Amino acid sequence: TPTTVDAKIVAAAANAGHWAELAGGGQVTEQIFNDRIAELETLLEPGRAIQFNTLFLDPYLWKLQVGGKRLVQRARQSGAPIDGLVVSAGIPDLEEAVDIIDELNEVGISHVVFKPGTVEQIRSVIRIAAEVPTKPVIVHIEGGRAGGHHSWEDLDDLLLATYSELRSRSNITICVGGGIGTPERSAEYLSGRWAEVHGYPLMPIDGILVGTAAMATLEATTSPQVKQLLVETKGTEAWVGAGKAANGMASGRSQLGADIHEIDNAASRCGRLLDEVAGDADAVAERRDEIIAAMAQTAKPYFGDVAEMTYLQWLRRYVELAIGDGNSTADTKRPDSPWLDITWRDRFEQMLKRAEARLHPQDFGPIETLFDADADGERLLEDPEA
Amino acid sequence: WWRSDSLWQAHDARYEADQVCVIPGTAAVAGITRVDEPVGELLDRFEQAAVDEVLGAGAEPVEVLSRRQARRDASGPLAVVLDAPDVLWAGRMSVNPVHRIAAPTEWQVREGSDNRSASHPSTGARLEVADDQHVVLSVPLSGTW
Ligand SMILES: Cc1cc2nc3c(=O)[nH]c(=O)nc-3n(C[C@H](O)[C@H](O)[C@H](O)COP(=O)(O)O)c2cc1C
Numbered sequence A: 001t002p003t004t005v006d007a008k009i010v011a012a013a014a015n016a017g018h019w020a021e022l023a024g025g026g027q028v029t030e031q032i033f034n035d036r037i038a039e040l041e042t043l044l045e046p047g048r049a050i051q052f053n054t055l056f057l058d059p060y061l062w063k064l065q066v067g068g069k070r071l072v073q074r075a076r077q078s079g080a081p082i083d084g085l086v087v088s089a090g091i092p093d094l095e096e097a098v099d100i101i102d103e104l105n106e107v108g109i110s111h112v113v114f115k116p117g118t119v120e121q122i123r124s125v126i127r128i129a130a131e132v133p134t135k136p137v138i139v140h141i142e143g144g145r146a147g148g149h150h151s152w153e154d155l156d157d158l159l160l161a162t163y164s165e166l167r168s169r170s171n172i173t174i175c176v177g178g179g180i181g182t183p184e185r186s187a188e189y190l191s192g193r194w195a196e197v198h199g200y201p202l203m204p205i206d207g208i209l210v211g212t213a214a215m216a217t218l219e220a221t222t223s224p225q226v227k228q229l230l231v232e233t234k235g236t237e238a239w240v241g242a243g244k245a246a247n248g249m250a251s252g253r254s255q256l257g258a259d260i261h262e263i264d265n266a267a268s269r270c271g272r273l274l275d276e277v278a279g280d281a282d283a284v285a286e287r288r289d290e291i292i293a294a295m296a297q298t299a300k301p302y303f304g305d306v307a308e309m310t311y312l313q314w315l316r317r318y319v320e321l322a323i324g325d326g327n328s329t330a331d332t333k334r335p336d337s338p339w340l341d342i343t344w345r346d347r348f349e350q351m352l353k354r355a356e357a358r359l360h361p362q363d364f365g366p367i368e369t370l371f372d373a374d375a376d377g378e379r380l381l382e383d384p385e386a
Numbered sequence B: 001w002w003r004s005d006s007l008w009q010a011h012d013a014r015y016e017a018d019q020v021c022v023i024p025g026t027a028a029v030a031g032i033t034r035v036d037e038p039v040g041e042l043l044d045r046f047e048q049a050a051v052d053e054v055l056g057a058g059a060e061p062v063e064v065l066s067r068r069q070a071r072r073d074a075s076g077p078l079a080v081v082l083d084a085p086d087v088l089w090a091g092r093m094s095v096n097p098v099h100r101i102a103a104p105t106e107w108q109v110r111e112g113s114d115n116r117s118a119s120h121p122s123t124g125a126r127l128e129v130a131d132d133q134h135v136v137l138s139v140p141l142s143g144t145w
Helices: A007-015 A030-043 A059-077 A094-101 A119-129 A155-166 A187-191 A224-232 A269-279 A288-297 A311-322 A329-333 A342-359 A365-371 A374-381 B039-059 B063-069 B077-083 B097-102
Strands: A051-055 A084-088 A112-114 A137-141 A172-177 A207-209 A249-253 A259-263 B086-089 B092-095 B108-111 B120-123
Touching: A007 A030, A007 B039, A030 A059, A051 A059, A094 A112, A094 A119, A112 A119, A119 A137, A119 A155, A119 A172, A137 A155, A155 A172, A187 B039, A249 A269, A269 A288, A311 A342, A342 A365, A342 A374, A365 A374, B039 B063, B077 B097, B077 B120, B092 B097, B097 B120
Parallel strands: A051 A084, A084 A112, A112 A137, A137 A172, A172 A207
Antiparallel strands: A249 A259, B086 B092, B108 B120
């Protein structure tokens, strides 16, 4: 999501002659994402091809994917370079998977990508494989030792048990992933020598994915300070259960309750406080002083006392947080950067217009008819202080 | 309010990076040392050292490795036609017509099999393939005359 959302890195990774999946978690519409593919295909040199990643998590995205898949359908009906589709966070049911495989863009899909997290999820994909035996299906088996979206399932035991049934389908391409930064450590899974430690006879793999080790890369959009942070983090051997920051890495749960692997060394303030607040919420009112100050430490600022705070302080706080002085929102608008906050600028307007709405005793003729003009209002907007 | 949309601050932000949720994995972090190392370098580093390990023991300076530095191939012109499912026209990608030419053809003909230069694959759909000017592969389809 953060890493591959940039059209620059996924292009550069592909231009290096490598397979990559464009992130869909950073694209909220067909149009905004169609810009990325267009930026991709422009930065895509002749013939080179890439794939796309999608999430199963929420209904709104799955309804957006109906427009998204038809976008992918339209793109490839137009002959778009994107040669694959990646379903994430869950395995679609047979009728849902058949649809994806059999789409008008099917040949341009050329294979389908699934990411099973459990034994049952693996067995589900096997049934998707037997569905269309002539359709290539790349099964990426991840761990919970991996980054981001998490799981309680071991790296080995899952693949150790399900491998035999996975190889009874020729259309299944087995790909092991997670906790791999190097060719040396990942060489044994390729030779099949990795299963020998568990006594099982050799168990070779068809491919390997690297999520984490590519984050510190040059063409990645990761900030200079964030890269240095990922670097100095020391790594670990097989994941341990004991709750702590483990080798600069501690798990944490998202808003939905699912675990997320985040960096607890580079940033120790957000994760641990979150675990404090989460486990502490009954009595929050009692620890309010301790809790409200810690939000300010991680820069999740509450506002100074709500009543007593002057309307300036309100309106000056939004400008403070929304408008960066270094990036110069006015100068940020000119390149037409995707980082543009314009909803935040629109947010501040609705607050400004509310301020006029609150204090005006008269008919509201003079004030409202001015700031609402395009040419006039937009000029007023690029200069927040004025 | 806390956890929502926390993934974007790691990229292009001047703020203190110790306040941000940034996502590694636990064990993969050990393999992360070099900073601002180009994607092309990391991915090749994987492939190049995987090749060497495979080369040294089993292959021992294989014909495949030697053929590469000397430019020799697998899947020549005749195979490439029957291999790649995608047929490019300009910047657009199309399915290989041979897939629908090979089997569905009533009369299909492969001329001079073992000889590569003279190799020709023709069909009753009136579509024929041959090589011209070295690397250029010539597919010739016809309607009536
Ligand atoms: C920052 C980040 C974002 C990720 N986003 C997604 C995602 O949107 N969908 C998905 O299936 N996996 C996602 N992953 C997981 C990777 O696709 C991959 O499975 C995992 O990172 C591989 O494990 P490793 O990086 O620890 O070696 C993400 C991983 C990271 C580090």
